[PDB]
Amino acid sequence: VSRSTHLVGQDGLCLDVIGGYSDNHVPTQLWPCGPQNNQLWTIQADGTIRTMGKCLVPNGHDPGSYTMIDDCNKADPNDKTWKLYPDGTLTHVRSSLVLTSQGTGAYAITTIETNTSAPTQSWGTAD
Ligand SMILES: CC(=O)N[C@@H]1[C@@H](O)[C@H](O[C@@H]2O[C@H](CO)[C@H](O)[C@H](O)[C@H]2O)[C@@H](CO)O[C@@H]1O
C-alpha cells in the first residue's frame, strides 16, 4: 500500500523540494523538517516516490547525478524506480546508486552516489 511520510536524513533534516515549487526539474535538498507539502513523500508499491504529484528522479544515472522532481509520465521506469530498505538505504534501482545528502546547510542538493554506507546515505520514515 502507498505510505505518505517524511524522508529523514542526516542530523534529522528532511528531504525537501527547494522553495516548495512543484515545477518539473526542481532539485531536492535537506531542510529542517516541517509540515509543508514539499516534505511529504508517498512511497508507492510501483517503486515511485512522489511529492506534490511529481516523482523523485535523478538527473542521470551516474555517481554524482543530482536528484529532483519530474512528471511521473515524463519518466521511464529506470528514472523513477526506487527501493527503500529497512536499514535506511534508498536505492535507485536501475543504477544501484543510493540517495546521498551533501550537507545540512541551505541548498545542499542531494545526489545519487556509490554506496559507502555513509551517514549521508541513511533515510528513515517518520509521520
Ligand atoms: C516567492 C517566494 O518567496 N516563495 C517562498 C517559498 O519558496 C518558501 O518555501 C520554502 O523554501 C525553503 C528553501 O528556501 C524550503 O524549500 C521550504 O520547505 C519551503 O517551504 C516560503 C517559506 O520560506 O516562503 C515563500 O513563500
GROMACS .gro file of C-alpha atoms in nm, residues 39-96:
model
   58
   39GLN     CA    1   0.846   1.744   0.257
   40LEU     CA    2   0.561   1.492   0.227
   41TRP     CA    3   0.657   1.194   0.019
   42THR     CA    4   0.450   0.898  -0.090
   43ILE     CA    5   0.629   0.570  -0.126
   44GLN     CA    6   0.434   0.359  -0.374
   45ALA     CA    7   0.436  -0.017  -0.445
   46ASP     CA    8   0.509   0.071  -0.808
   47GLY     CA    9   0.851   0.188  -0.689
   48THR     CA   10   0.794   0.563  -0.729
   49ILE     CA   11   0.845   0.820  -0.456
   50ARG     CA   12   0.615   1.120  -0.501
   51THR     CA   13   0.556   1.467  -0.371
   52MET     CA   14   0.313   1.732  -0.493
   53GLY     CA   15   0.204   1.493  -0.768
   54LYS     CA   16   0.558   1.461  -0.912
   55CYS     CA   17   0.820   1.186  -0.893
   56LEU     CA   18   1.167   1.187  -0.739
   57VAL     CA   19   1.419   1.113  -1.013
   58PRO     CA   20   1.794   1.155  -1.061
   59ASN     CA   21   1.905   1.378  -1.349
   60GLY     CA   22   2.107   1.091  -1.497
   61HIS     CA   23   2.229   0.752  -1.377
   62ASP     CA   24   2.589   0.820  -1.283
   63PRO     CA   25   2.755   0.884  -0.950
   64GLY     CA   26   2.714   1.249  -0.864
   65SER     CA   27   2.387   1.296  -1.051
   66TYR     CA   28   2.158   1.532  -0.862
   67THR     CA   29   1.801   1.448  -0.774
   68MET     CA   30   1.490   1.644  -0.848
   69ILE     CA   31   1.120   1.608  -0.915
   70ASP     CA   32   0.967   1.546  -1.256
   71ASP     CA   33   0.645   1.438  -1.425
   72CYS     CA   34   0.593   1.073  -1.348
   73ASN     CA   35   0.467   1.031  -1.708
   74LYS     CA   36   0.774   1.212  -1.846
   75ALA     CA   37   0.980   0.947  -1.671
   76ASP     CA   38   1.073   0.594  -1.778
   77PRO     CA   39   1.082   0.322  -1.508
   78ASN     CA   40   1.461   0.349  -1.486
   79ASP     CA   41   1.435   0.712  -1.384
   80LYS     CA   42   1.162   0.685  -1.125
   81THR     CA   43   1.203   0.347  -0.958
   82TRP     CA   44   1.347   0.343  -0.605
   83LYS     CA   45   1.364   0.099  -0.318
   84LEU     CA   46   1.386   0.197   0.046
   85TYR     CA   47   1.547  -0.070   0.254
   86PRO     CA   48   1.477  -0.115   0.623
   87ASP     CA   49   1.828  -0.016   0.729
   88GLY     CA   50   1.791   0.322   0.563
   89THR     CA   51   1.945   0.270   0.220
   90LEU     CA   52   1.741   0.438  -0.053
   91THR     CA   53   1.843   0.276  -0.376
   92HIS     CA   54   1.794   0.399  -0.730
   93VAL     CA   55   1.704   0.059  -0.870
   94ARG     CA   56   1.842   0.078  -1.225
   95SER     CA   57   2.186   0.215  -1.124
   96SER     CA   58   2.218   0.059  -0.777
   0.00000   0.00000   0.00000
